[PDB]
Write a protein that binds this ligand. Structure first.
Ligand SMILES: [Mg+2]
Ligand SMILES: [Mg+2]
Ligand SMILES: [Mg+2]
Ligand SMILES: [Mg+2]
Ligand SMILES: [Mg+2]
Ligand SMILES: [Mg+2]
Ligand SMILES: [Mg+2]
Ligand SMILES: [Mg+2]
Ligand SMILES: [Mg+2]
Ligand SMILES: [Mg+2]
Ligand SMILES: [Mg+2]
Ligand SMILES: [Mg+2]
Ligand SMILES: [Mg+2]
Ligand SMILES: [Mg+2]
Ligand SMILES: [Mg+2]
Ligand SMILES: [Mg+2]
Ligand SMILES: [Mg+2]
Ligand SMILES: [Mg+2]
Ligand SMILES: [Mg+2]
Ligand SMILES: [Mg+2]
Ligand SMILES: [Mg+2]
Ligand SMILES: [Mg+2]
Ligand SMILES: [Mg+2]
Ligand SMILES: [Mg+2]
Ligand SMILES: [Mg+2]
Ligand SMILES: [Mg+2]
Ligand SMILES: [Mg+2]
Ligand SMILES: [Mg+2]
Ligand SMILES: [Mg+2]
Ligand SMILES: [Mg+2]
Ligand SMILES: [Mg+2]
Ligand SMILES: [Mg+2]
Ligand SMILES: [Mg+2]
Ligand SMILES: [Mg+2]
Ligand SMILES: [Mg+2]
Ligand SMILES: [Mg+2]
Lengths: 85, 76, 50, 64, 96
RNA sequence: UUUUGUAUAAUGGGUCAGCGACUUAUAUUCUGUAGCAAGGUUAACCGAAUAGGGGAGCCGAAGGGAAACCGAGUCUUAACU
RNA sequence: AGGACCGAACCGACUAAUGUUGAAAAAUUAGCGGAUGACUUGUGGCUGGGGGUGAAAGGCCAAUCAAACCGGGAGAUAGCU
RNA sequence: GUUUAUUAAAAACACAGCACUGUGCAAACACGAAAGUGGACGUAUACGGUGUGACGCCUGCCCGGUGCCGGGAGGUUAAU
RNA sequence: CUUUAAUGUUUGAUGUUCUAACGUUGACCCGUAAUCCGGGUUGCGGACAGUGUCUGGUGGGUAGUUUGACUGGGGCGGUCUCCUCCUAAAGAGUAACGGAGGAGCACGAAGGUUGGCUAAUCCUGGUCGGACAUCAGGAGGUUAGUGCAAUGGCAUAAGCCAGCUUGACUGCGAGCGUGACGGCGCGAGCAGGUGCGAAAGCAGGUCAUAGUGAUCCGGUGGUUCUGAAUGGAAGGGCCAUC
């Protein structure tokens, strides 16, 4: 009897680890110096006042304060800035 | 490798080294040729296809990254 | 895996070396770069080696 | 009998002043041309055994 | 130290250091410990005769680890520069 | 009993009586309790011997460094804000 | 004359039925093959366990054999019931 | 003719016959740490192994592979 | 001293000759009522054979064991680590033998700075010359480009070109992110030297995310840290690296 029929394979089915990108400190959060605000892959958020940009385009605080999200600019490109507290 | 005798001796002894090495080079390809008909052969009913021969074939395919005995008689 | 590892032994005598890679079949010349030598704490000329 | 110590762990950990254990950072034996200098100089100092691993070391070293 | 099959913590990390034979024959003396030995002379023998360091210990050091009252003449030892400031105060002579 | 799940047609037991399964030596850490307290305690052995001797030793009051070494500091480093 | 013929003792075991907690841990009844041969049988010997013996089936070696039985290592080990 | 004592008696095993191969005798070969023993109180028209299997006609091609036999220069190669 | 030729004289390799080791499962004699043994007399081999220690080859004759997991039962087929997108339900994460592709590198410039610049594509005109080459001016505005996949980005360019160059530095590092851990990552700022720029400044590799391997063991360079009586040394340790 022909009970069990042969089956094919799948050419794909491999993937990679998740990089946990995103915003780590949302607006209105009092944050210390040198800490990480948002993890990027490009630059969806640019660096405003008192913040910097790593080689990964990671945005980090420079001096302590509050987190501010703003949309200044001719091309409506979003920034992040930190106040003075 | 060194050689004894006058100059014409070397030409004779070198040609034997080239001929023999040509003779053994073809024999190695002969085994590897018939060890690739076997890798893609059907298994049969409930047999396993010994991996003491699949790994050896893996070592034969890897060994083919070796020197090409004839430099190639450049054509012009 | 064409590139081969090499090291740059210091000319300042103090046994020191940076290591790097080099495409040896397209770069017959030997590197000679000026880099820090922490033993003598000066910028000297580093020449290629093994 | 006395509890035999695990001689392999006694060569890798050393008890500190408040009951902790110091070890030597891994990944600094060979293949050292690839790694960035920032990475190597950070594995040079000693380290502290984490809270999760703490249970497995006090078991291996009963006399120290 | 069996982690289920993966390399255990004590084989995953490298060995370091070397144990010294010299550190097994030295010791430390507390400053509160100088009032126990004898009529006022401190040496290797005057301590190890008072059950203060091991009989097979040939070096010693006196650290600022208490409070000394009586003047004592440390015959030959390696008093630190903090306990020296506490032995000369009480009236103690220090030599080699 | 084992299971996601058993009246289960899944396991075991015919019934009664007797027997039958988390122990013992040494070592190490934590908790309670007792004695002493910057001290605590003896081992073998001696002993008219559960007394009394015996303090050989062990833990603790100091740590840092791979180590020499320094020491309430020490290590790294040419030096650390 | 003959590893000739038919055929009881003797040796074996092809078919069928009964028996399968049997009369019997392989037998009984009815037939069945060899029956002067490479036959069959009594008594006593010899070959010992990774070994023997085997006209060869992994057969037999005390109703047990792809490595006997007895004692010991021994309370082997069991991530399994 | 023999065989699975106890589910298989056969086309399986043996066989007389054939071929190959080893053995010159203190034979090859086998049982034995060894002495020794069987072969054999035998001597190549004999003994051992291997395959085939009365008798009749026959038994074709391949020495590349893996084995075995002969070689004795060269290359590689141990202890000393 | 560089080639060379003999007498010897040490032994080294092949050859032959002898006897005294050794062999005799040849003959004879004795212990001996004895086809074992021992001894003696002779014959034949003879420094061979054989045995002992060391050594290369062969050696399923024998022995001990190994021979992965996932899986829509097992075998066969496929896969096993790393990167990108969807599934993934607008923070993070999230499975299937779900749907699609990639990596195991490259680069002493393709890196650092200081200057300057801006594409695709179509239309029109023009020698060969064209559907598509170079050229000119128009529309258009990144539909182009990026060393190599996909995604996110990029005009202040992160794309294109040129000059000078070695920061593709040494010691550290507040504070964070992500993991059960091992680990992985981003980092202002401090000190020592350096490059470019007139300076303000920027530079601890490359637009970012793959381009990779623990520990043990050993090799190479440096360093009085240690050095089993003492002075060395060996051998260990620390730093850089294979
Ligand atoms: Mg190292
Ligand atoms: Mg494993
Ligand atoms: Mg004492
Ligand atoms: Mg069930
Ligand atoms: Mg119910
Ligand atoms: Mg019922
Ligand atoms: Mg039931
Ligand atoms: Mg069951
Ligand atoms: Mg029952
Ligand atoms: Mg007859
Ligand atoms: Mg008949
Ligand atoms: Mg008859
Ligand atoms: Mg009958
Ligand atoms: Mg039987
Ligand atoms: Mg067995
Ligand atoms: Mg046992
Ligand atoms: Mg049992
Ligand atoms: Mg039968
Ligand atoms: Mg029979
Ligand atoms: Mg029968
Ligand atoms: Mg014989
Ligand atoms: Mg046949
Ligand atoms: Mg034929
Ligand atoms: Mg076997
Ligand atoms: Mg076994
Ligand atoms: Mg075993
Ligand atoms: Mg097995
Ligand atoms: Mg499986
Ligand atoms: Mg999400
Ligand atoms: Mg959601
Ligand atoms: Mg670039
Ligand atoms: Mg510019
Ligand atoms: Mg650039
Ligand atoms: Mg890139
Ligand atoms: Mg010495
Ligand atoms: Mg060394």
């Amino acid at each position: 009897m022909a009970h069990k029929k042969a089956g094919g394979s799948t050419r794909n089915g491999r993937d990679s680890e998740a990089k946990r990108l995103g915003v780590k400190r949302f607006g209105g959060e009092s944050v210390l110096a040198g800490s990480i605000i948002v993890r990027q892959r490009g630059t969806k958020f640019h660096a405003g006042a008192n913040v910097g940009c790593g080689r990964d385009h990671t945005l980090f605080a420079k001096a302590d304060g509050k987190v501010k999200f703003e949309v200044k600019g001719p091309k409506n490109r979003k920034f992040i800035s930190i106040e003075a507290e | 490798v060194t050689y004894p005798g006058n100059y014409d001796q070397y030409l004779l002894e070198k040609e034997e080294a080239l001929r023999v090495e040509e003779l053994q080079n073809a024999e190695f390809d002969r085994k590897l040729a018939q060890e690739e008909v076997w890798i893609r052969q059907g298994i049969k009913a409930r047999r396993t296809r010994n991996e003491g021969r699949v790994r050896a074939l893996k070592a034969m395919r890897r060994e083919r990254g070796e020197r090409r005995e004839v430099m190639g008689t450049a054509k012009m | 895996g064409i590139r081969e590892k090499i090291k740059l032994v210091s000319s300042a005598g103090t046994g020191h070396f940076y290591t790097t890679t080099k495409n040896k079949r397209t770069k017959p010349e030997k590197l000679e770069l000026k880099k820090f030598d922490p033993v003598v704490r000066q910028h000297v000329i580093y020449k290629e080696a093994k | 009998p006395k509890i035999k110590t695990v001689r392999g762990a006694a060569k890798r950990f050393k008890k500190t002043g408040k009951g902790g254990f110091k070890h030597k950072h891994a990944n600094l034996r060979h293949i050292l041309t690839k790694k960035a200098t920032k990475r190597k100089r950070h594995l040079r100092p000693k380290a502290m055994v984490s809270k999760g691993d703490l249970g497995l070391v006090i078991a291996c070293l009963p006399y120290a | 130290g069996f982690e289920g099959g993966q390399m255990p913590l004590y084989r995953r990390l490298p060995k370091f250091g070397f144990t010294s034979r010299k550190a097994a024959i030295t010791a430390e003396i507390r400053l509160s410990d100088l009032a126990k030995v004898e009529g006022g002379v401190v040496d290797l023998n005057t301590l190890k005769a008072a059950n203060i360091i091991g009989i097979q210990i040939e070096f010693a050091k006196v650290i600022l680890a208490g409070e000394v009252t009586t003047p004592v003449t440390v015959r030959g030892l390696r008093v630190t520069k903090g306990a020296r400031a506490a032995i000369e105060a009480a009236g103690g002579k220090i030599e080699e």
